[PDB]
């Protein structure tokens, strides 16, 4: 994982050296950012199934194609619906994660390791999640350091499709 | 290795489930007490010397089979492997201590370690009493209140001792 | 014979012997020198677990409502749940063994191993 | 001229490859010298070398060497020269070399130079010849000589436990350190002065390790409980 | 590793035996079927990739417990995995297809392959499932018409989903 | 040095990696954290000339054989006691780089890196320097959280020396 | 490596003098634009993809005689390593960003660079226009007031474009 | 390793004990048959070639299962590890000789010997033969009185051939 | 060890060859130097009982208040005086297996490897013992050859001390 803790635990266990007073204000800076960020995955969870349903009705706005044309890699039919609903549930879920451990963490265990090998042997373009992304990161309906706190997370998972 | 939110993480990855609000609240009030957390760790780091040579001195004060000659402490380098062995484990305590869990310290310090002791030859059970010796020390030193404010911090000693204990039972 | 009732076997305590170095967990300095850990969620420092984090509710809110994709109970168990509570390692209080459980006998409705062992 | 025979490959981690663009917290931090390290870095990549090649436990005066230490920090020996330093060291060769026999001993080697565990038994059979008809200048030159080697580390970074643990998991594989100890369970028993090889656990009449019941005062203990604040 | 000819060049030397005549016509039609050997692997080469991922889209479509939460397949990073997993074994086999036997198949992909899916986690049978569904999407790719001569390749095709059943059986 | 700054910037480059949220709170750590050693710092330099000379004189008080026993080692004649001053300055000295900086670097840096070849070689015990850091962390009249700062890099630095 | 505190904590040693009242105002000053520091690199951090992109897209519609055949970004391999050459060079300097002076990007990115792209026969020049194309595309983008309080945070604006500028004249 | 003066110098030490007169009177008739013990591994060093291709020729004049085809030294390679695996056992026990006991033999050669041999099929006890013909090969070569004072030094030959008798029955 | 025997044998078998006429001169000197070393070892070991408490008060004349400072570190009580009397046979003993093994190879093995790290954790001075050993070679009544069979291994162990 890349917490905080994980990452200040490392780097004193690399040395072979106690938790110096170094360590310390590393671990107490992820403390006191916590309580903005903790709020932040509070409004997302709730918020979460109309921002789901929100931006995949943006990416088939954006790209109509991907209703129309036959194939697997679509959804033109039931079933593609459903796992491109499923995915987006997916990014949103892994958003949430790495706003409570603090630090991307989760989604380069679980999202970002190996993602363009399924997107190039599954056919389908990162365009697509991105277009998706930016519908998430414009109607959270979050303000102040919360609205930072997720914007800095999406925009992780933007980079890493580009 | 995970700590103690990565690992609530985890189990709500492998069932594919978000967070619900009341582990949302699990997890507050463990920011709740950061600076409890901290204090601990900081006075046993600052006390670690003291507590690994006298938890040491009162080993052999008690089995003074161990430094007679023939004995598994009786060199210059056996005895420095003692007590760099005492501080490696007081070392991943405290790993675990900031970390919530018990992950960093039963993964790269207590696998294999019995089989390692069983190997060369070293009594397990003697360092078993050697970390409950730096158990009592390090817990009698993190219930001093120089330099720290006025309130209560038992339930994380409890949490401390938890860890000690692990280690004690995971050497015989 | 009632609520409160004493039974000799339900006696788990040093009353009819007196070994007078057995008590209950009272100050903060007996963690260190007298107690252990508690075997059990009932017997926890209260609201923490048995090892001693804060207690967490356990159950999340399901992601992704549908009956062949998204969690069910035909889904496997994840390998790192066992994992996540250190309950692979041989130390820990929930390490299950399989050499003794009731699963690793064999079964008798097998026919092979009956005739193999008439 | 008796060419080293073949032995078969198996299954590891490292022979596979990863995936992990953006690793997590389990990369065990390249010590390179074309970082260009200050002299606080070269000191912490001596400590890195000492903690790889000797154990944890060796890092004791008597055994560190300071002089291939000054020609390190000179540029003059690079780091693959310095582990070729410490193998050949002369702490090195009477706590590790004389305390086993040349199968254990170049497990040892595999283990702490290569950083991955051996394939089979056939490889310890195998490379435990070139120790014997060479010295050990000669298996320490055609160890870092390897494609294996050269391909992983080069000849400027510290070698490391290459792909221990799985990326999802918790528990991943032993290190090698604690799985690979100075001597093993044959040579200890009569010739490494170690009797008894085992330890009953220390009885006692004042008991120290009970388990606390359920209602005992201890678990509620606590302490200026309501701050009371104002009126 | 050996190829066929090297096989029974082994076999001869290990008793010191010259080759016999009767030999030379076994080496000899190897020999005449050597385009017909070499057109298999070259149409199995130019269709791994839609080999390898029609057969993993047609896995989970029958077994979808794998790539739903707490699958062995649910990640980015597993099912990734299982994908470059696959692409070795079908790698394997077109060695062992130009080898002639199967021992670079057994030697340096199946040795120990048993034994990491038992302490991984993951289900052989699955595997298992997956090496017979690129099997004969590989046979009857390989008696496509187009491309070549048109005559009979037949124990060839039945020696290539020997060494998938030789691939199958071995990591359950 | 062991700067957190220079901390997280080891492990993003070590990743070969930019510089993502998990370091960015690690330095936000030590940002809110100095305003408290900084004071520690300050109230530490001016009370400098009465601190060195009073762990100095401890040192006599408590091995009173230091100024008798004659031999270079031993504080006897004036030279050796210009010298002791002088070793106890550069502690102090020392413990309030390491309070700016924020972490065990400078000292690392510059007194604990070949410091028992010193006193092998220089045959001078590491029992009066230990002796000498405890009355200044008796004595340095600090409180609070700064007090807590300025006790840690001494305690590291008894550490060491035991 | 050093930060801006460790530089004059190695001034104030090398010459052996207590720290003046006078630096820990000049070091406080530092402390109070703390989250102004943290500011630009998060927004730096955050658009470091398009940075690249568009000012490596903007650098062959200008200077069209590299991606065009025998120039020196005229393959797949060297247009990718041109990007990640980019790429480089924009974490360092945020890495000099956040540590307040320019050490770690002197010391571990520009020490030989000239000597490198002279060896390979890359253009230098080319790569200083380049950099000065990341230059402005990142502090436009740090002067974008979109999820910050209002305030002024132009003096750290400059001294991000010195890095930049630094960058730029060492690898002519 | 050890030589005969520091094994009971390992005994006293394990025991704390003083060394006696008597065993002072034990070291000191080692030292005096120095001379004698260096002009027998002198006289095995100088005809160490003879020795192992004598014994091994007349190991497969007896033995000729080996060398024929199917064999296990039926190879010029397997022929030339036979030969160097003598020339290993010859050189150890010639290093015991002079260390007055055998644990460079114990340690460092024959520790893991048997096991290697039934790991790679070699019949251990025709290894054991060809030992034996090396020891009788040595103590009649032992036993010349060409270039050495008239003497008698019958019992460090007994000394001699223990050692190839320890190193014959530690590898069947 | 670092006998002659195994010094010889080490060299002969990192070449791979056998024991020529180099490694024989190198083993015939150890033994014609033996007749020499093995009289100092007998005359210490008579000598042993009377030169322990000879070393232990010269120490405790030397240093005085190793006596009086209260503490587990000082021969201050009973226990201690029984240490450090165990401590001063535990050198002579190594002294005297270097003078039959010839070189310094017990106590390399036994004495001066980790000796720095047991004499900073238990907070005790090298210089007591190099008190101690002068004693030694100053009191040891042996002359000729035999006197500088002893002064060395004497030597060699107040030279790893200091
Ligand atoms: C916005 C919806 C668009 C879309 C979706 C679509 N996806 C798939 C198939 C897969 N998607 C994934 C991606 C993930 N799986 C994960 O577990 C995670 C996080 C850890 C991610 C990001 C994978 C692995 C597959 C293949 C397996 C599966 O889920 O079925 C498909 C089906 C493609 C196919 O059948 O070959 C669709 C249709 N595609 C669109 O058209 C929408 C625009
Ligand atoms: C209180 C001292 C007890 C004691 C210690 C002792 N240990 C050893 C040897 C080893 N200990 C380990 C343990 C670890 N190594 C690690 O890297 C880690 C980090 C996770 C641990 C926990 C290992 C691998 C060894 C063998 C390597 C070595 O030789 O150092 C020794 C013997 C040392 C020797 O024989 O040379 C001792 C004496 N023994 C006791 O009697 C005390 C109870
Ligand atoms: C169809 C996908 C199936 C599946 C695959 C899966 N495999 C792994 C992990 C490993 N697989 C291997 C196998 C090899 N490694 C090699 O180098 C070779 C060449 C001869 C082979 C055959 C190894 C060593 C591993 C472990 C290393 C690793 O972690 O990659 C995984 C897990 C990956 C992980 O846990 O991170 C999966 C998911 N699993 C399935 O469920 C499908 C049936
Ligand atoms: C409290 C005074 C006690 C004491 C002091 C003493 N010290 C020395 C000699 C040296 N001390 C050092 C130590 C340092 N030098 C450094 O630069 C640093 C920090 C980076 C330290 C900790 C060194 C190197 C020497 C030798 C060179 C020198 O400074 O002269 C001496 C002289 C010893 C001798 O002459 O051999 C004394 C007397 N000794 C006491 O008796 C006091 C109790
Ligand atoms: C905008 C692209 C410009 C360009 C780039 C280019 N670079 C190379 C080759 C190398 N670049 C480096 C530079 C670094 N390596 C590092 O590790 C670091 C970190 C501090 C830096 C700054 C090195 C060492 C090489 C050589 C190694 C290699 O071959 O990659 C190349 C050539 C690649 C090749 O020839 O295969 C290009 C094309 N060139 C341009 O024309 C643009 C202006
Ligand atoms: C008289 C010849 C007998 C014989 C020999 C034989 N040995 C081998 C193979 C090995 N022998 C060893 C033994 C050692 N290796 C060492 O380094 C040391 C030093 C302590 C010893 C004693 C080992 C490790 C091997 C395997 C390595 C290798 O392959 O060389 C072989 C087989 C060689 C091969 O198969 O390629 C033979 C034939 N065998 C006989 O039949 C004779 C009785
Ligand atoms: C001259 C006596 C001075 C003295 C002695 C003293 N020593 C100790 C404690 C230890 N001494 C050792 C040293 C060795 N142990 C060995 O096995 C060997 C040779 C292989 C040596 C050189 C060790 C390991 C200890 C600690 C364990 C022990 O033996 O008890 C003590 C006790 C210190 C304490 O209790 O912390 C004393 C008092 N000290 C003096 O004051 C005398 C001048
Ligand atoms: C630089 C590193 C660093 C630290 C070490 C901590 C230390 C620290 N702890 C506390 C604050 C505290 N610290 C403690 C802990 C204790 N008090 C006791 O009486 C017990 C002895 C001990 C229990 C283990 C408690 C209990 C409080 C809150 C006061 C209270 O409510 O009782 C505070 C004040 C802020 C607050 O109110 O929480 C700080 C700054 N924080 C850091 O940033
Ligand atoms: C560049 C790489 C390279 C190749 C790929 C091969 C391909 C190749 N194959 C054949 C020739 C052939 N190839 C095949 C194989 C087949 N025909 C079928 O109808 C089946 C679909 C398939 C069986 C697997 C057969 C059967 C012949 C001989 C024609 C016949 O007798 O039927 C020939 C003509 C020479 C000959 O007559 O043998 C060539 C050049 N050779 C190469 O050098
Ligand atoms: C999680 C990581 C993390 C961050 C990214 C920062 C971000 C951050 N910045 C500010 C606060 C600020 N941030 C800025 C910076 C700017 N404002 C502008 O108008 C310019 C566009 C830009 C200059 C570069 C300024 C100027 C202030 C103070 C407000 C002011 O006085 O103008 C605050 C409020 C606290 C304060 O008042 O200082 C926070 C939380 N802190 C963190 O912990
Ligand atoms: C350069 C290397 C080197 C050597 C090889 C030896 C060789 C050597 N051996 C002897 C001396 C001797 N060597 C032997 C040994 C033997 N005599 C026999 O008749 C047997 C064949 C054989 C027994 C194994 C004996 C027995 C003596 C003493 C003469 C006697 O008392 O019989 C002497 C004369 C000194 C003395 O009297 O001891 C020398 C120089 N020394 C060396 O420095």
């Not at chain 1, 903790?38 to 706005?61: C, D, E, H, M």
């Not at chain 3, 809110?61 to 309950?87: K, W």
């Not at chain 4, 120290?208 to 701050?227: C, H, I, S």
Request: glycine share 6%; hydrophobic share 40%.
């Amino acid at each position: 994982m890349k917490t905080p803790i994980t990452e200040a635990i490392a780097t004193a266990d690399n040395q072979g050296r106690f938790l110096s007073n170094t360590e310390l204000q590393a671990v107490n800076g992820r403390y006191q950012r916590a309580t903005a960020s903790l709020t932040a995955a509070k409004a997302l969870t709730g918020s979460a199934q109309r921002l789901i349903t929100g931006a995949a009705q943006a990416v088939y706005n954006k790209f109509p194609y991907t209703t129309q044309m036959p194939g697997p890699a679509y959804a033109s039919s039931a079933i593609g619906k459903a796992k491109c609903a499923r995915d987006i549930g997916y990014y949103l879920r892994m958003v949430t994660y790495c706003l409570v451990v603090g630090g991307t963490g989760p989604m380069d265990e679980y999202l970002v390791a190996g993602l363009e090998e399924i997107n190039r042997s599954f056919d389908l373009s990162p365009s697509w999640y991105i277009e998706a992304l930016q519908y998430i990161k414009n109607s959270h309906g979050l303000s102040g350091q919360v609205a930072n706190e997720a914007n800095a997370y999406i925009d992780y998972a933007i980079n890493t499709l580009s | 290795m995970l700590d103690a939110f990565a690992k609530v993480v985890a189990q709500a990855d492998a069932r594919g489930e978000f967070l619900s609000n009341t582990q949302i609240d699990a997890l507050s009030k463990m920011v709740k007490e950061g600076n409890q957390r901290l204090d601990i760790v900081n006075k046993v780091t600052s006390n670690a010397s003291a507590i690994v040579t006298n938890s040491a001195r009162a080993l052999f004060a008690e089995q003074p089979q161990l430094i007679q000659p023939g004995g598994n402490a009786y060199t210059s380098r056996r005895m420095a492997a003692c007590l760099r062995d005492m501080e490696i484990v007081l070392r991943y305590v405290s790993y675990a201590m900031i970390a919530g869990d018990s992950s960093v310290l039963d993964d790269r310090c207590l696998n294999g370690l019995r089989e390692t002791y069983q190997a060369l030859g070293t009594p397990g059970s003697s360092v078993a009493v050697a970390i409950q010796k730096m158990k009592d020390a390090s817990v009698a030193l993190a219930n001093d209140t120089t330099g720290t404010p006025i309130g209560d911090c038992s339930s994380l000693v409890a949490e401390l001792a938890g860890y000690f204990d692990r280690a004690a039972v995971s050497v015989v | 014979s009632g609520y409160g009732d004493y039974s000799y076997s339900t006696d788990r305590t040093k009353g009819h012997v007196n070994q007078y170095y057995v008590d209950k967990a009272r100050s903060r300095s007996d963690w260190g020198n007298r107690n252990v850990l508690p075997a059990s969620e009932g017997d926890a420092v209260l609201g923490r677990t048995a090892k001693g984090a804060v207690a967490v509710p356990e159950f999340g809110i399901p992601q992704l409502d549908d009956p062949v994709l998204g969690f069910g109970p035909d889904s496997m168990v994840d390998p790192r749940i066992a994992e996540a509570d250190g309950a692979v390692w041989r130390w820990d209080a929930g390490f299950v063994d399989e050499s003794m459980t009731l699963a690793s006998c064999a079964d008798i409705s097998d026919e092979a191993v009956a005739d193999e062992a008439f | 001229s008796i060419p080293i025979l073949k032995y078969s490959l198996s299954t590891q981690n490292q022979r596979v490859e990863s995936f992990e663009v953006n690793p997590g917290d389990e990369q065990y931090r390249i010590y390179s010298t074309d970082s260009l390290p200050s002299s606080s870095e070269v000191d912490q990549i001596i400590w890195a070398a000492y903690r790889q090649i000797f154990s944890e436990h060796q890092i004791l005066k008597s055994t560190k060497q300071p002089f291939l230490e000054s020609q390190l920090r000179f540029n003059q020996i690079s780091i693959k020269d310095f582990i070729k330093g410490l193998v050949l060291s002369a702490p090195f060769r009477d706590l590790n070399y004389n305390v086993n026999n040349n199968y254990r001993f170049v497990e040892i080697c595999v283990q702490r130079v290569l950083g991955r565990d051996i394939y089979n038994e056939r490889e310890k059979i195998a490379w435990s010849i070139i120790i014997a008809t060479q010295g050990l200048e000669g298996f320490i030159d055609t160890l870092l000589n390897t494609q294996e080697y050269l391909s992983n580390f080069g000849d400027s970074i510290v070698p490391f436990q290459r792909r221990r643990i799985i990326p999802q998991r918790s528990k991943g594989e032993m290190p090698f350190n604690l799985k690979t100890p100075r001597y093993g369970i044959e040579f200890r028993s009569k010739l490494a002065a170690t009797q008894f090889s085992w330890a009953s656990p220390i009885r006692r009449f004042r008991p120290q390790e009970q388990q606390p019941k359920a209602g005992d005062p201890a678990l509620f203990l606590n302490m200026v409980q309501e701050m009371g604040p104002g009126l």
